[PDB]
């Protein structure tokens, strides 16, 4: 569908082809996070630290519960029906997340039957029996620091010193917590927050959380690094200071007739100057339909592109004509920096601007020369079995295109300028010219 | 001032209205930060670590003092008068910050009278009596690690091991400090740097700093997360290695006749295709004057927008006409992704593209159909008391606009393409057409 031979002559060399995959069909699990450590074994060294801490934490946690109660108070069994008048204003994502919250409340009640057991945990990771067949895990923040550092040194330092260390530790924990769980969290109903961000309530240790939950797949790290594993807050307890989180663990679905093609840019010669083409480097093809893709939000591996949603974006007719053969519609920009690439290798064949860089044939010891009419040279083993470019010595294969590559020219496109202030300058000048003509 | 009924028909549904607030009138307090721990109680386990550390820290701190001395040497009481010839080149903000530094020098001298008391602190947080009525606080980096970990284990491990641990801890502290206090800090005279960034000299525990200073208010977390609490370096001591910081703590002022209005985007149907409107989502109105706002720099809460400065930016006449009723001037873009929203809820009334998504009436069991001439449907309880959209079942209120909403059409605008490379392509094609006409 793309015209690779014509594109290689304006410095756009064919790269790697990759598959397209998107997350779907999540599996759900629940877990408890308690945001206050147990100080029973050092109760005589606390002073007034815990009361002040609890006042601060209550101030933090109250608005989240307030936001959850709006959807919890206005949803009931008929499927389930929401009351639109009470809700007032919402997006589709918020409404679907509210449905999910209502679905989770049943297991929330079953877990909340064990409140006194939750309050007594004294380790970082504890297992409890929700039912004879079902279990629930509890993770407690700062418990490892209490159990391993402060308790073993009780008599070696004085009580005031222990109290001051505990105060400092709690304040540092709050300093790390406030970016994620503070006023920035104005909409907790959704289910798009990543598990890495949620794990800040447990010191940022998401690996332990996922290991305890028991997830195990071959695509685990790919799902982690594409931001595809999310969690949703389902319940907040303000007298025991804990939260319940539901974790969504999806699979990856491959789109059948789609792929992403990469292009490698190389400079070229025209009219005693150096130029580079202004064309996107990644192109999405779906059922012979060409579009752009916002690939900065996805994960790029050697074999596939992995995304948490569909990121296709539209493309103009002129650019589509550029990529299918009309090279006179492809814009270009002048080169003024020495860091732009000058050669590339594709399918064992070299494409090089032998005017900017010096090229030799190792086999015969002779120079490889490019005239002022050519843009760049294709070098393969019909003419040069082994080539020398600066430091590099490379052996080459055979080209699979036209035998007359280096004797046939191309039609060039119009220059452009992509600087941000230059855009405003060009728009202003064009408007002035348009007024002058009229 | 905005025409919401006309805008809802091109997929721009009315959202939440918010107040506008800006910081003002700061209250100032001084505090001391010492960047070297006291090793008196393990003096036989230090080796040559401290001398090397002091050489490195002196190298870091010398240019900051040099930058302060330029303003300190060229300012004197007449108000206060600066010497412009000596200064040479400066912005208005730098000059005002220099005035503030001169104002702070007096309390700097009063605090500097206690140098020997500063050098003797042996805790992380210490209070000292500057005057019979005024006190000053000292925070010491890494002192908690010294007091709680290294000192209590002196005989359990060998001297070399203690020395190596201390060396590693100091090197890690420098590794964290260098981004904020290194060569990136070329202008220390200003007072625009946040307290969170300043607290890297105390391990990033800004909560402890603010709690010791004694600030208290109901808008505390809102002020923190809007980056409105700043500090300024006033004095550097290179023989005792400490700095003096002045903290500015403001209040929030509400702008009287201003508000920020949000728009929720929904796709719509035209000519057997799906489209989305290219219009800003947040609009600022001040005394019936409409403008844009760079809201990415502000904090968005449920009831107000909180900013550390005035972020209003101008709007074109065409866009202003778009927002006041002329829908033929609002541009649009083609939809090629499946993730674009398809319905929304406003004041208990549903706006939905019932061509892309299946809509049903739960009350009567009958389908709700949209023709090819309509953009989207308004659904309320005069026609559908309860609606079903996929999973969601929702009960609805009554619309407050025209009774003939679904029988009256609108005038559409022109397509655009917002991709960055497409901008250059379109500009080039327009220039070529303009030349061709001439």
């Amino acid at each position, epitope marked *: 569908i793309l015209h690779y031979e014509k594109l290689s002559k304006i410095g756009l060399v064919k790269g790697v082809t990759r598959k397209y995959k998107i997350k*779907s*069909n999540p599996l*759900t699990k629940d877990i408890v996070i308690k945001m206050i450590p147990n100080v029973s074994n050092m109760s005589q060294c606390t002073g007034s630290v815990m009361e002040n801490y609890k006042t601060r934490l209550n101030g933090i946690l109250t608005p989240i519960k307030g936001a959850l109660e709006i959807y919890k108070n206005n949803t009931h069994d008929l499927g389930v029906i929401m009351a639109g008048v009470a809700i007032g204003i919402a997006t589709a994502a918020q409404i679907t997340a509210g449905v999910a919250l209502y679905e989770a409340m049943k297991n929330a009640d079953n877990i909340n039957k064990l409140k006194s057991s939750i309050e007594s945990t004294n380790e970082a990771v504890v297992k409890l029996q929700e039912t004879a067949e079902k279990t629930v895990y509890v993770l407690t923040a700062l418990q490892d620091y209490i159990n391993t550092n402060l308790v073993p040194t009780i008599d070696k330092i004085s009580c005031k010193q222990t109290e001051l260390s505990l105060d400092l530790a709690l304040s540092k924990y709050l300093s790390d917590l406030l970016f994620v769980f503070g006023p920035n969290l104005q909409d907790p109903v959704s289910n798009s927050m990543t598990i890495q961000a949620i794990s800040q309530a447990f010191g940022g240790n998401y690996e332990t959380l996922l290991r305890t939950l028991g997830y195990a797949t071959e695509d685990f790290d790919d799902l982690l690094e594409s931001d595809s594993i999310t969690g949703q807050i389902i319940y907040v307890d303000l007298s025991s200071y804990y939260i319940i989180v539901r974790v969504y663990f999806p*699979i990856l679905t*491959e789109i*059948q*007739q789609a792929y992403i093609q990469e292009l490698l840019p190389v400079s070229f010669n025209n009219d005693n100057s150096e130029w580079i083409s202004i064309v996107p480097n990644f192109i999405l093809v779906r059922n012979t339909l060409i579009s752009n893709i916002e690939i900065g939000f996805c994960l790029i591996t050697k074999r596939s592109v992995i995304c948490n949603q569909d990121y296709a974006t539209p493309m103009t007719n002129n650019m589509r004509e550029c990529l299918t053969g009309s090279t006179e519609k492809c814009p270009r920009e002048l080169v003024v920096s020495s860091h732009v690439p000058r050669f590339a290798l594709s399918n064992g064949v070299l494409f090089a601007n032998c005017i900017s860089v010096t090229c030799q044939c190792q086999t015969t010891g002779r120079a490889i020369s490019q005239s002022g009419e050519q843009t760049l040279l294709m070098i393969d083993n019909t003419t040069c079995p082994t080539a020398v470019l600066g430091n590099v010595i490379i052996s080459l294969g055979k080209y699979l295109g036209s035998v007359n590559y280096n004797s046939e020219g191309i039609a060039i496109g119009p220059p452009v300028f992509t600087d941000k202030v230059d855009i405003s300058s060009q728009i202003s000048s064009m408007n002035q010219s348009l007024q002058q003509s009229k | 001032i905005l025409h919401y009924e006309k805008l809802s028909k091109i997929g721009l549904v009315k959202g939440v209205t918010r107040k506008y607030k800006i910081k003002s009138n700061p209250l100032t307090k001084d505090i001391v930060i010492k960047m070297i721990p006291n090793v008196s109680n393990m003096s036989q386990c230090t080796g040559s670590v401290m001398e090397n550390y002091k050489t490195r820290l002196n190298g870091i701190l010398t240019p900051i003092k040099g930058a302060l001395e330029i303003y300190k040497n060229n300012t004197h009481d007449l108000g206060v008068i600066m010497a412009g010839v000596a200064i040479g080149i400066a912005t208005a903000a730098q000059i005002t910050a220099g005035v503030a530094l001169y104002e702070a020098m007096k309390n700097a001298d009063n605090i500097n009278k206690l140098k020997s008391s500063i050098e003797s602190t042996n805790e992380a947080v210490v209070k000292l009596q500057e005057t019979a009525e005024k006190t000053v606080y000292v925070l010491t980096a890494l002192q908690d690690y010294i007091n709680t970990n290294l000192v209590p284990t002196i005989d359990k491990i060998s001297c070399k091991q203690t020395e190596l641990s201390l060396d590693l801890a100091l090197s890690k502290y420098l590794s964290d400090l260098l981004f904020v206090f290194g060569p990136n800090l070329q202008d220390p005279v200003s007072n625009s740097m946040t307290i969170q960034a300043i607290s890297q000299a105390f391990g990033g525990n800004y909560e402890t700093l603010l709690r010791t200073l004694g600030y208290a208010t109901e808008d505390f977390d809102d002020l923190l997360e809007s980056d409105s609490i700043t500090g300024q370096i006033i004095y550097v001591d290179l023989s005792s290695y400490y700095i003096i910081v002045r903290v500015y703590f403001p209040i929030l002022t509400e702008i009287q006749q201003a508000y920020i209005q949000e728009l929720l985007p929904v796709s719509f149907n035209n000519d057997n295709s799906e489209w989305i409107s290219i219009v800003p989502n947040f609009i600022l109105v001040r005394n019936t004057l409409i403008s844009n706002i760079e809201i990415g720099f502000c904090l968005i809460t449920k009831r107000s927008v909180i900013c550390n400065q005035d972020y209003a930016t101008p709007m074109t006449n065409n866009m202003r006409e778009c927002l006041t009723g002329s829908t033929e001037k609002c541009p649009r873009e083609l939809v090629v992704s499946s993730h674009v929203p398809r319905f929304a809820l406003s004041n208990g009334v549903l706006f939905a593209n019932c061509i892309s998504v299946t809509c049903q009436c739960q009350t009567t069991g009958r389908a709700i159909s949209q023709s090819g001439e309509q953009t989207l449907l308004m659904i309320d309880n005069t026609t559908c008391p309860t609606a079903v959209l996929g999973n969601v079942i929702i009960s609805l209120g009554k619309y407050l606009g025209s009774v003939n909403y679904n029988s009256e059409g609108i005038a559409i605008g022109p397509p655009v393409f917002t991709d960055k490379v497409d901008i250059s392509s379109q500009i080039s094609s327009m220039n070529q057409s303009l030349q061709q006409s001439k």
Partner: antibody
Amino acid sequence: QVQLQESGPGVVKPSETLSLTCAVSGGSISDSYRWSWIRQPPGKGLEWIGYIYGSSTSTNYNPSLKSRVTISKDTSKNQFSLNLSSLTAADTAVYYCVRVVQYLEWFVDLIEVNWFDVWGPGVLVTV
Amino acid sequence: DIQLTQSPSSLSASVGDTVTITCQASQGIGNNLHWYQQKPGKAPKLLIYRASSLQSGIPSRFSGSGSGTDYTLTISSLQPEDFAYYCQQGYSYPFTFGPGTKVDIK
């Protein structure tokens, strides 16, 4: 529509490799479908085994039988084969080569729906 | 894996009988649940796919509906020639079947 035929050795000794080739008529194996194998031991029900994509080289296998199994396809003869290793006492069954239909549902998020509609005659393997 | 249960487990009926059965899931599976038609000794077939859609060639007496973890199938006016039916999920790998109740001859 699509016609299918399973072929292979009727009787194989235990712990010997089993190759089963399903030949496809009434359509091209390069279709945008999934070609799967299903095992039905006599006296028992059905059990999915795995598949290979029609329009790509990707594969998927059941966790219980993953280590011993391999799947391949051939466009020239329009035939896809399964290889099973270390046949045992319970491996006596009837093998079906089937097409699996998939539908993609977009509603805020993505859900893929899979179900069985068309199978093959089936041949019995004796250990 | 996702586990499915069914209730009840007895279907002994003659011409002209009305029944309702339920299939429950270990967690929510959207509508990725299908009521199949298994044929003895050859290729099986299907009754209802996507939990509410009637397969072609099937009498219009059958109906299906459900949400979340609970789904139901309703049948009227039995013909006892047909043999086998089940509830099945295609939400998670591997695809699995429930216990089931099918047409039985007394």
